[PDB]
Amino acid sequence: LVKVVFMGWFKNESMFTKEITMMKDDVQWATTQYAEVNKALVKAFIDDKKVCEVDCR
Amino acid sequence: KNFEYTIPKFSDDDRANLFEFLSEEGITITEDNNNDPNCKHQYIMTTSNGDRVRAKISIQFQGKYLQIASLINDFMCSILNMKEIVEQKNKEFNVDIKKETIESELHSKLPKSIDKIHEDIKKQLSCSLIMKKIDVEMEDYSTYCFSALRAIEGFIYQILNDVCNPSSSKNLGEYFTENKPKYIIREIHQETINGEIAEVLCECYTYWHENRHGLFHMKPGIADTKTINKLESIAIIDTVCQLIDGGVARLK
């Protein structure tokens, strides 16, 4: 159970950001969802380090 | 589309080779030349379509297409051990839990569906039900939804998988099409699906898709720190089990 920050970039180079506290094992899936929903590239950081990335643009 | 996933720990061999079989059905894996060398092995994971992937080293994948992505994920759920979590929480929390308790809660939740659904699903649902056990109030409950959503998602496959057994192993959207109320099966599949099965599928999909959409849609230009309320989460967890339990009964 950790705090995660998600960072996303839309096709147009706009940006979005989220902070959530959630169980670690869901992070990738979560990351996957953000990208799939928004057609975005999302990176997920825990403790300032990048644990996952997905791209759906 | 591309992705990278970096997994700390993992396999210690057992999981990795363990992991590979499943991917066995059906993708092609082959060793590849390892250059700069903190990495024991490098592999290429392949498909008829034209997928690619990587390794390895405490392991990393980078890949052309999402599809291997899913498989790797399902497995990790597979690793998933219920007993296993329990120690962690208390250590996380004062609270002490008889794991065997939950099933009571869980069984209670899916009275007619308990033994008719894949274990993988249960595990996710059981995870979501942790919330009922813990008295401490909390900042965010979203995680609980996430489990819920995951379960339902799996549930859809389980049906899909049985009803149409496809080599392709595609995605949920693929089967579904958009109508202003409940979603509907794509015309292409209506021949095969075309049921009360369909209704169950659509009832479920529709719940998943919007909640997924509600939770993960982001406004551009924003830096959300919002949190999901408890009731807010309960409605969801509870609602899902009903669909799942209800679906099984309705589809005897």
UniProtKB/Swiss-Prot annotation, chain A:
InterPro entries noted in UniProt: Dmd
Highest rank taxon of the organism: Viruses
Outcome of gene disruption: Phage grows very poorly in wild-type E.coli K12 or in cells expressing plasmid-derived toxin-antitoxin system LsoA-LsoB; if the host has a deletion in rnlA-rnlB no effect is seen. Absence of full-length transcripts of late (18 to 28 minutes) T4 genes, and thus loss of synthesis of late proteins. Partially suppressed by overexpression of host IscR.
Keywords from the named record: Evasion of bacteria-mediated translation shutoff by virus, Host-virus interaction, Toxin-antitoxin system
Subunit record text: Can form a complex with non-cognate host toxins LsoA and RnlA.
Function: Antitoxin component of a potential type II toxin-antitoxin (TA) system. Acts as an antitoxin against host toxins RnlA and LsoA, preventing them from degrading T4 bacteriophage-derived mRNA and thus permitting successful virus infection. Stabilizes middle (8-10 minutes) and late (18 to 28 minutes) T4 gene transcripts.
Stated name of the protein: Antitoxin Dmd
From Swiss-Prot, chain B:
Keywords linked to the UniProt accession: Endonuclease, Hydrolase, Nuclease, Plasmid, Toxin-antitoxin system
Gene Ontology molecular-function annotations: RNA endonuclease activity
S-S bonds: none
EC number: 3.1.-.-
Note: This plasmid is only found in Sakai-derived strains of E.coli O157.
Record's subunit section: Can form a complex with cognate antitoxin LsoB and with enterobacteria phage T4 antitoxin Dmd.
Function (record text): Toxic component of a type II toxin-antitoxin (TA) system. A stable (half-life over 20 minutes) endoribonuclease that degrades mRNA. Degradation may be translation-stimulated. Overexpression in the absence of cognate antitoxin LsoB causes retarded growth and mRNA degradation, this effect is mitigated upon coexpression with antitoxin LsoB or enterobacteria phage T4 Dmd. Degrades late enterobacteria phage T4 mRNAs, protecting the host against T4 reproduction.
Name of this chain's protein: mRNA endoribonuclease LsoA
The organism of origin for this protein: Escherichia coli O157:H7
Residues of the full protein shown: 90 to 345 of 346
